[PDB]
Amino acid sequence: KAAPKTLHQVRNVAYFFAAWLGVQKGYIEKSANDRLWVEHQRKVRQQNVERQQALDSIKLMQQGV
Amino acid sequence: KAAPKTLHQVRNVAYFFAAWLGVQKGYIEKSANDRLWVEHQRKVRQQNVERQQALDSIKLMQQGV
Amino acid sequence: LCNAASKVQARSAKKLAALTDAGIQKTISEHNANGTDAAVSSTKRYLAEQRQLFHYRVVRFFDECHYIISGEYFAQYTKVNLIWDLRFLTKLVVLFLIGTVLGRQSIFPPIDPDSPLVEALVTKVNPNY
Amino acid sequence: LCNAASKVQARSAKKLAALTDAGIQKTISEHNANGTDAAVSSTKRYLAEQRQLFHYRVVRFFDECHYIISGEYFAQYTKVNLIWDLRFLTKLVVLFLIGTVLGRQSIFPPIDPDSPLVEALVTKVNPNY
Amino acid sequence: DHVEKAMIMRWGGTLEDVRKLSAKDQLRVRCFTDIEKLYSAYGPKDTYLQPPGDTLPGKDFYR
Amino acid sequence: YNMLVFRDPKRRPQLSEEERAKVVVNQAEWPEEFKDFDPDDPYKNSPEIIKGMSSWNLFLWGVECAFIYQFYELVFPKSI
Amino acid sequence: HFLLLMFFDFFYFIFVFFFYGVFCYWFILFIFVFCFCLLFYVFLYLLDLFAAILQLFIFCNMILQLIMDFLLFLLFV
Amino acid sequence: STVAISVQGLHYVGTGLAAIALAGVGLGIGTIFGNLLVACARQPNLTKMLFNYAILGFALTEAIGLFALMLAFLMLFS
Amino acid sequence: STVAISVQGLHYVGTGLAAIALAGVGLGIGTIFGNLLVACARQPNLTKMLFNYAILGFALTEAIGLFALMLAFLMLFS
Amino acid sequence: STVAISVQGLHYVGTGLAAIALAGVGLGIGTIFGNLLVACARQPNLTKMLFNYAILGFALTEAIGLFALMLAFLMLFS
Amino acid sequence: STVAISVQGLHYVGTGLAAIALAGVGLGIGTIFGNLLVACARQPNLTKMLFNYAILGFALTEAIGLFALMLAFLMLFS
Amino acid sequence: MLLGGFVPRRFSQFNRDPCWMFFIFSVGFWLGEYPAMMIKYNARDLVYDPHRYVWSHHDDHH
Ligand SMILES: CCCCCCCCCCCCCCCCCC(=O)OC[C@H](COP(=O)([O-])OCC(O)COP(=O)([O-])OC[C@@H](COC(=O)CCCCCCCCCCCCCCCCC)OC(=O)CCCCCCCCCCCCCCCCC)OC(=O)CCCCCCCCCCCCCCCCC
Ligand SMILES: CCCCCCCCCCCCCCCCCC(=O)OC[C@H](COP(=O)([O-])OCC(O)COP(=O)([O-])OC[C@@H](COC(=O)CCCCCCCCCCCCCCCCC)OC(=O)CCCCCCCCCCCCCCCCC)OC(=O)CCCCCCCCCCCCCCCCC
Ligand SMILES: CCCCCCCCCCCCCCCCCC(=O)OC[C@H](COP(=O)([O-])OCC(O)COP(=O)([O-])OC[C@@H](COC(=O)CCCCCCCCCCCCCCCCC)OC(=O)CCCCCCCCCCCCCCCCC)OC(=O)CCCCCCCCCCCCCCCCC
Ligand SMILES: CCCCCCCCCCCCCCCCCC(=O)OC[C@H](COP(=O)([O-])OCC(O)COP(=O)([O-])OC[C@@H](COC(=O)CCCCCCCCCCCCCCCCC)OC(=O)CCCCCCCCCCCCCCCCC)OC(=O)CCCCCCCCCCCCCCCCC
Ligand SMILES: CCCCCCCCCCCCCCCCCC(=O)OC[C@H](COP(=O)([O-])OCC[N+](C)(C)C)OC(=O)CCCCCCCCCCCCCCCCC
Ligand SMILES: CCCCCCCCCCCCCCCCCC(=O)OC[C@H](COP(=O)([O-])OCC[N+](C)(C)C)OC(=O)CCCCCCCCCCCCCCCCC
Ligand SMILES: CCCCCCCC/C=C\CCCCCCCC(=O)O[C@H](COC(=O)CCCCCCC/C=C/CCCCCCCC)COP(=O)(O)OCCN
Ligand SMILES: CCCCCCCC/C=C\CCCCCCCC(=O)O[C@H](COC(=O)CCCCCCC/C=C/CCCCCCCC)COP(=O)(O)OCCN
Known part of the structure; x- marks a missing residue:
C-alpha cells in the first residue's frame, strides 16, 4: 500500500466544508437582518399607537367633559 | 439489431420537453404580471401629476393674479 | 476526536473487506499498490464512456421513435408497459410543475396590482425578502 | 422535419462508426444484438461501483489525512503540487462565496431598516419580486 | 474615479457624507453605476431621466 | 486543420512516388508518442504537461477566477 | 476605435441583459442575434487589423513619393 | 435684443446627413467589384x-x- | 435670453435621412450583378x-x- | 427656460425621406436587367x-x- | 413647459419627397430599354x-x- | 506573421502545452465573466439608487 499520489477525497471534504461555512455566514447575516426588521416593525407599531393615543387625547379635550 | 426493449432516450427527451414547457408557462405568467405592474406604476405617476397640477391650480387661484 | 476517527476507519475497512466482489477487490488492490484512487478512476471512465456514447444515444432515440411511430410498440403492449407509462406520466407532470415554479421564480402566482392582496405585499416584515 | 431527422441520424451513425474503440464497439454490438441500451447500462454500472466504493473513499480520506498530517506530503513538495493547491484554494474561495449567497438567499446583502436605501425597496415596480 | 464621483454627487456631494453610509450601501450604489455603464446608450432612459410624478428626490435635493 | 486563425503547418513531400513506394515502414522504431501517426491529429498521444490536469479543468479554473473577481465584493464589501 | 467601442457596448448590453431568452420560447431570435454579433465582431477585428497595416504602408508611401518627386537618376556609361 | 437658444433635437438631423455619405461608399464598393468580375x-x-x-x-x-x-x-451620442 | 427647446419629432427626420443611404447600397448591388452577367x-x-x-x-x-x-x-427609438 | 415641444406632423418628412431610398433600388434593378439583355x-x-x-x-x-x-x-403609423 | 403642436401642412412636404423616388424608377426603366436597343x-x-x-x-x-x-x-390623403 | 507553432486539434489537447494551458484558462475567465455579470446585474434583490435622479453624467457633460 504505497503513499497516495492524489488527495482528491480530502479536497472534496474541504469543498463541502467551505460551502457549508459560506452557508452559515449567509444564514447568520439573514437572521440578523430579519431580527432588525422585526424590531423596526415593532417600533413602528408602538409609534402608531402613541400617535393614536395623542389624537384620542386631543379629541377628549375637544369634548371637554 | 433487434427491436428496443426500453425507451429510455425518448423518456429523457420528453422529460426535458415537459420541464421546458413548464418554464415557458412560468415565464409567460411572470412577464404578464410585470407588464401589469408597470402599467399600474405609470397610472400612479399620472395620478400624482394630476393631483400636483390641481394643487398648483388652487394655489394659483389663492394667489389671485 | 481521534478515537472516533480510528473507529470509523476500522468500520469502513471491515465493510470494505466484507464485500465479496472479485472485480471491486481486484481494482482496490491494484489502486492501493499503485497508490491511486479507484473511485476517481471509475468516475473518469464513466464520463469518457458517456462522452463516446452520445451519438449512440441519438441513434437509439431515433430508433425508439421509429419503433413507437410504426405501431409495433403498441402491438405487444402489456401490463408492465402500462406501469412504466404511468411512471413516465407522473414524472412528466411533476417536471412540468417544477418547471412552472422555476419559470415564474416563485412558489405561488404573483399578485396583480388590482388584487386586494397587495396590502400583504405592502405590509411585509422584511421588504428585502 | 423528416429530412432533417434523417440527416441527423445519418451523421450520428457515421460518427459512431468512426470511433475505433474496441470496447465501445463491442458493447454497442452486444447491446444492439440484445436490444438493450448501452448508455443506461454504463450509468447503472457506475452507480453500483460508486455505491460499493463509499467505504473505500472513507479509507482513502483517512489515509490521505494521515499522509498530510505526518508531514510526508510536504517533504516531497514540488511545483506541480503548488499548482494543484492553488487550484484547490480557488475552488474553496468560489464555493465559500456561492455558499454565502445561497445562505442569505440573495446576491446582495439585505438592506437594514435604518439604511437610506429602504426607499428603493418601497418604490419597487413589482413588489412580488 | 467615476464611481467615486457618482457616489459623492448622489449622496451629499462630500466624501464624509458617503462615508456616513455602510459598506453595503456603497456596494449597492457602485453596482447601480455598473448597471448604468452596461446600459449606456441602449438601456432604458428612466435610469437618469426622472419621469413626471416620480416621488424620488430631484436634482435640488441637497441644494 | 485550424484552431481559429492558427493553422497547423504541413511538411511538403520530398520523395517521388517511385522512390516512396520502395520505402519500408517500421513503426517499431518510432517513438511511443508518434505511433499510428495521423496528420489530422498528430498530438493525440502527446503526454499531458501536468498529469490529471485536463483542458476543461483549466477552463473551469478561469471561470472560477472570473466569478471570484465579480463576486468578492458582494461578500466582503469595503468602504470608500 | 469609436466604432469598435460602440459595437462592444451593444454586444455587452445584449449578451448580459438578454441571455435569459435562451431558456424562453423566443430563444431562436436571441441565437440569431448572437451569431450575427459574433460574425460582426470577427469582421471588425479583421478589418481593423488589415487597415492598421495598410495605413502605415500609405503613411510611409506619401513620404517616399515626396522624395521621389525630386530625384534624378543618371545612366552609367 | 440678445437671445440665446439651445435646440436639443438638432443633433439627430446632423447624424442622418452624415449617414448619407455611406451612399457614395456602398456604391463605390459595387463599382470595384463590378470591374473585378469583368477583369477576371x-x-x-x-x-x-x-x-x-x-x-x-x-x-x-x-x-x-x-x-x-x-x-x-x-x-448621435453627444 | 437663454431658451432650451426639446423637439420630440426631430428623430423622424434623422431616421429618414439615414434610410437614404440605402440608395447607394441598392445601386451598388445592381452594379455588381450587372457586371456579373456581362462577365459570365x-x-x-x-x-x-x-x-x-x-x-x-x-x-x-x-x-x-x-x-x-x-x-x-x-x-428612431432613442 | 426649459421648454418641451411635441410636433405631431413631422413623421411625414421622415416617411418621405425613407421613400427616397427606393430610387437607388429601382435604378439598380434597371442596371441588372440592362446588363442581362446585353449579356444574353x-x-x-x-x-x-x-x-x-x-x-x-x-x-x-x-x-x-x-x-x-x-x-x-x-x-407613418406612429 | 409642455407644448403639443399639430401641423396640418407638413403632409405636403412628405408627399413631395416620395415623388423623388420616381426619378430613379424613371431612369431605371430608360436604362433597360437603352440596353435593349444595343442588345437587339x-x-x-x-x-x-x-x-x-x-x-x-x-x-x-x-x-x-x-x-x-x-x-x-x-x-396626401391624411 | 502566423507561420507555425503548436496547434491543438481540439479542446482536449489544450493541456498538451503550457502556453495553450494559459490560453484556455484566459478563455475560461473571459467567457465565464459574462454569466457572472448576468447573475449579478439581473438579481432580484438589485435595487436602483434612490438618488439616481439627483445627478447624472448627462447633466455633467452637457
Ligand atoms: C441565487 C443564485 C446564485 C448562483 C450562484 C452561482 C452558481 C454557480 C455558477 C458557476 C460558478 C463557477 C463554477 C464553480 C464550481 C464549483 C463546484 C465544482 O466544480 O465542484 C467540483 C468539485 C470536484 O472537482 P475536482 O476536485 O476537480 O474533482 C476531481 C475528480 O473528478 C473527483 O471525482 P469523484 O469521483 O470524486 O466524483 C465525486 C465528486 C464530484 O461530485 C460533484 O461534482 C458534486 C457536484 C458538483 C457541483 C457542486 C456545486 C456546489 C455549489 C453550492 C451548493 C449548491 C447545491 C449543490 C447540490 C449537489 C447535489 C449532489 O463528489 C464530490 O465532489 C463530493 C463532495 C461532497 C463531500 C461530502 C463529504 C461530507 C463529509 C462530512 C463530514 C463531517 C464530520 C464532522 C465531524 C465533527 C466532529 C466534531 O466538487 C466540489 O467542489 C463539491 C462541492 C460540494 C458542496 C456541497 C455543499 C452543500 C451545502 C452545505 C451542506 C448542508 C447540508 C449538510 C449539512 C450537514 C452538517 C454539517
Ligand atoms: C424555488 C425552489 C423550487 C423547488 C421545486 C422542487 C424541487 C424538486 C424537489 C423534488 C421533487 C420530486 C422529485 C422529482 C425528480 C424529477 C427529476 C428526475 O428524477 O429525473 C430523472 C429522470 C431520469 O430518470 P429515469 O427515467 O428513471 O432514468 C433511467 C436511467 O437512470 C437513465 O440513465 P441515463 O444513462 O439516461 O442517465 C442520464 C440521464 C439521467 O440524468 C439525470 O438524472 C439528470 C438530472 C436529474 C434531475 C433533473 C431535475 C430537473 C428539474 C428542473 C430543472 C432544474 C435544473 C436541472 C439542472 C440539471 C443539470 C444536469 O439524463 C437525463 O435525464 C437526460 C435529460 C436531458 C435530455 C436532453 C435532450 C434535449 C434534446 C432537445 C432536442 C430539441 C430539438 C428541437 C427540434 C425542433 C424542430 C422544429 O431524468 C429527467 O427527468 C431529466 C429531466 C431534465 C430536465 C431539464 C430541464 C432544464 C430546463 C429546460 C431547458 C432550458 C435550456 C435549454 C433550452 C433549449 C431550447 C429548447
Ligand atoms: C432499510 C429500511 C428500508 C425502509 C423501511 C420502511 C420505511 C422506514 C422509514 C424510513 C425510510 C427512509 C427512506 C428509505 C431509504 C431511502 C434511501 C435508500 O435506501 O436509497 C438507496 C439507494 C440505492 O438503492 P437501489 O435500489 O440500489 O437504487 C439503484 C440506483 O438508485 C439506480 O436506480 P434506477 O435504476 O431506478 O435509476 C433511476 C434514475 C432516477 O434518479 C434520480 O432521479 C435521482 C434522484 C434525483 C433527486 C430526486 C429527489 C430525491 C428525493 C428527495 C426527497 C426525499 C424525501 C423523503 C426522504 C425521507 C428520509 C427519511 O437514476 C438515475 O438516472 C441516476 C440519477 C442521476 C442524477 C443525479 C443528480 C440529481 C440532481 C437532482 C436535482 C434536484 C435537486 C433539488 C433542487 C433543484 C432545483 C432546480 O441509494 C440512492 O441512490 C440514494 C440517493 C438519495 C439519498 C438521499 C435520499 C433522501 C434521504 C434518505 C434517508 C434514509 C435514511 C435511512 C437510515 C437507515 C439506517 C439503518
Ligand atoms: C474546440 C474548442 C477549443 C477552444 C478554442 C479557443 C476558445 C474559443 C472560444 C469558445 C470556447 C468555448 C468554451 C470551451 C468548451 C467548454 C466545454 C467543453 O468542451 O467541455 C469539455 C469537457 C470534456 O472534455 P475533457 O477534456 O474530456 O474533460 C474531462 C472530463 O470533463 C472531466 O473533467 P476533469 O477531469 O477536469 O474533472 C473535473 C471535475 C469537476 O467537473 C465539474 O465541475 C463539472 C462542471 C460543473 C459545473 C461548473 C461550472 C461549469 C462552467 C459553466 C460556465 C461557463 C461559461 C462560459 C461558457 C462559454 C461557451 C461559449 O469533474 C467531475 O467531478 C465531474 C462532474 C460531476 C458532477 C455533475 C453535476 C454538476 C452539477 C453542477 C452544479 C452547478 C450548476 C450551476 C448552478 C448552481 C446553483 C447552486 O466537457 C465538460 O466537462 C463540459 C460540461 C459542462 C458543459 C457546459 C459548459 C458551458 C458551455 C460550453 C459550450 C461550449 C461550446 C463549444 C462549441 C464548439 C464548436 C466547434
Ligand atoms: C498562522 C497562519 C495562518 C494562515 C491563514 C491563511 C488563511 C487564508 C484564507 C484564504 C485566502 C484566499 C486568498 C486568495 C483569494 C483572494 C480573493 C480576493 O481578494 O480577490 C479580490 C479581487 C477583486 O478585487 P476587487 O473587489 O477590487 O475587484 C472587483 C472589481 N469590479 C468591481 C470591477 C468587478 O479578485 C481577483 O482579482 C481574483 C483574481 C483571481 C484569484 C485566483 C488566482 C489563481 C491563479 C490564476 C493564475 C495562474 C493560472 C495558471 C494557468 C496555467 C498554468 C500552466
Ligand atoms: C499577424 C496577425 C496576428 C493575428 C492574431 C490573432 C489572435 C487571435 C485571438 C483569438 C481570441 C483570443 C482571446 C483572448 C482572451 C483573453 C482574456 C480576456 O478576457 O480577453 C478578452 C478581451 C476583451 O473581450 P471583451 O471585450 O468581450 O471583454 C468583456 C469585458 N467587459 C465586459 C468587462 C468589458 O478580448 C480581446 O479584446 C482580444 C482581442 C484580440 C485581437 C487581436 C490582437 C492582435 C494584436 C496583438 C498581438 C500581440 C502579440 C505579441 C507577441 C509578442 C511581441 C514581441
Ligand atoms: C431553485 C432551487 C435551488 C436550490 C438550492 C438550495 C440551496 C440552499 C442552501 C442553504 C440552505 C439553508 C438555508 C437556511 C435558511 C432558510 C430560511 C428559510 O426557510 O427561508 C425560506 C426558504 O426555505 C424554504 O422554502 C426551504 C425549506 C427547506 C427545503 C427542504 C428541501 C428538501 C429536503 C428533503 C429532506 C429529505 C430528508 C434528507 C435528510 C438529510 C439530512 C439527515 C425563504 O423564505 P424566507 O424569506 O426566509 O422567510 C419566509 C417567511 N414568509
Ligand atoms: C440556486 C440556483 C438554482 C438554479 C436553477 C435555474 C433554473 C432556471 C429555469 C428558468 C430559466 C429561465 C428564466 C426566464 C426568466 C428570467 C428573468 C430574469 O432575468 O429574472 C432574474 C433571473 O435572472 C438571473 O438572475 C439569471 C440570469 C441568467 C443566468 C445564466 C446562468 C449561467 C449561464 C451560462 C451560459 C454559458 C453558455 C451556455 C450556452 C448554452 C446554449 C447555447 C431575476 O430577477 P427578476 O425579479 O426577474 O427581475 C430583476 C429586475 N430587478
Missing part, C-alpha cells in the same frame, strides 16, 4: 492580383465610410 | 468563381447598409 | 442561367427597399 | 425574347415606384 473574365490566370487590389481598395473606401460613421456617432 | 457571358467557364466574388461584394455592401440602418433604428 | 445577346445559349442570377440580384436588391419601406410604416 | 442591334434574332425580359424588368422596376407613390397618397 478576360484574365482568369491573373485572378490573384485583381482580387487583392479589389480588397485593398475596399479598405480605402471603407475608411471614408468609417470617417462619416464616427461623426454620426459623435453627433 | 464573356467567360462562362468561371461562373462559380465570379458568383462567389459577387456574393462577397454583396455582403460588404449589405454591411454598410446595416451601419446606415444602425443609425436609423437608434435615432 | 452575347451568349444566347446560356440565357436561362443568366436569368436566374438576375432574379437573385433582384431578390437581394428588393430586400433593401423593404427595410426602407419598413421604416416608413414604423413612422 | 447585337443579336436581332432574339429581339422577341429580349423584349419579353425587358417588359419583366420594367414591371419589377415599376413596382418599386408604386410603393413610393402609395406613401404619397397615404400622406
